[PDB]
């Protein structure tokens, strides 16, 4: 048993390992989306920059969960990072990102339920302090972006996506 382990259920340790994989998966999805906008036949540099920043943020989220695992005396178990499942347009990518962030949020809420069921207040506070509000903010931002693109006439209006790239993501 780890000399540091205290009040850390094996189920919580396993759930943290699963969450690490999901954060890495999200980083990979955003990496894919970024380079789609870097294609010569899409060419929206600010969409590309936005999604690359989001990819790097997800890698940081994964590293912080890996640090947590070690802080609590758990053992990191890594699995394959699946390739992104399925970008068409700026609007479609924003919609896919909104769906991804809501999926990650659901996983974090399930993790919090488990921590609450196992009476682990440190883990509850960790999730609340570093992940829950970040998710709410990401989801709101992506919703705002989807709304604007739709109102502007995307995805049929290439002018809409061009101007959004310059004015909102620039």
Residues 1-30, mask of contacts with Cl ion (x by CB under 5 A): ----x--x----------------------
Residue nearer to Mg ion on the CB measure, 43 or 76: 76
Q: How far apart are CA 31 and CA 51, in angstroms?
A: 7
138 part of the interface to Fe ion, by CB under 5 A: yes
Q: Which two tokens stand for residue 53?
A: 């920043």
The CB-of-9 to a second copy minimum distance in angstroms stands at 13
What is the sign of the dihedral through the CA atoms of 131, 134, 140 and 142?
Answer: negative
Consult the annotation and say whether 60 binds a ligand: no
The single residue listed with the structure tokens 């000399």 is 3
Cα 141 from Cα 94, distance rounded (Å): 10
Contact between 125 and Fe ion (CB under 5 A)? yes
5 contact choice in Fe ion, Mg ion, Cl ion, none (CB below 5 to 8 Å, kind-dependent): Cl ion
Measured distance CA(114)–CA(79) in Å, rounded: 21
Q: Does 128 count as an annotated binding residue?
A: no
* C-beta of residue 148 within 8 angstroms of C-beta of residue 142: no
Under rule CB under 5 A, residue 58 binds Fe ion: yes
Minimum distance from CB of 10 to a second copy (Å)? 17
Q: 24 or 90: whose CB is closer to Cl ion?
A: 90
- Number of neighbouring beta carbons within 10 Å of residue 54: 22
Known binder of ligand: residue 95?
no
Residue matched to tokens 């290439």: 158
State the residue for tokens 């207040």: 121
Euclidean distance between CA atoms 56 and 7, whole angstroms = 32
Nearest approach, Cβ of residue 82 and a second copy (Å): 5
Task: Report whether 141 belongs to an annotated binding site.
Answer: no
| Interface positions with Fe ion (CB under 5 A) | 23, 54, 57-58, 61, 86, 96, 125, 128, 138
Known binding-site positions for Fe cation: 23, 58, 61, 101, 135
């Amino acid at each position: 048993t780890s000399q540091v382990r205290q009040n850390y259920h094996q189920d919580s340790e396993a759930a943290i390992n699963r969450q690490i994989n999901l954060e890495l998966y999200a980083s990979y999805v955003y990496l894919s989306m970024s380079y789609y906008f870097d294609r010569d036949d899409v060419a929206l540099k600010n969409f590309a920059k936005y999604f690359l920043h989001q990819s790097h943020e997800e890698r940081e989220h994964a590293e912080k969960l890996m640090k947590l695992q070690n802080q609590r005396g758990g053992r990191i178990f890594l699995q394959d990072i699946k390739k992104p499942d399925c970008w068409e347009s700026g609007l479609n990518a924003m919609e896919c990102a909104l769906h991804l962030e809501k999926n990650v949020n659901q996983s974090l809420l399930e993790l919090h339920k488990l921590a609450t069921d196992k009476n682990d207040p440190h883990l509850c506070d960790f999730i609340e302090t570093h992940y829950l509000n970040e998710q709410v903010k990401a989801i709101k931002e992506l919703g705002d972006h989807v709304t604007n693109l739709r109102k502007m006439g995307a995805p049929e209006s290439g002018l809409a996506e061009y101007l959004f790239d310059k004015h909102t993501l620039g």
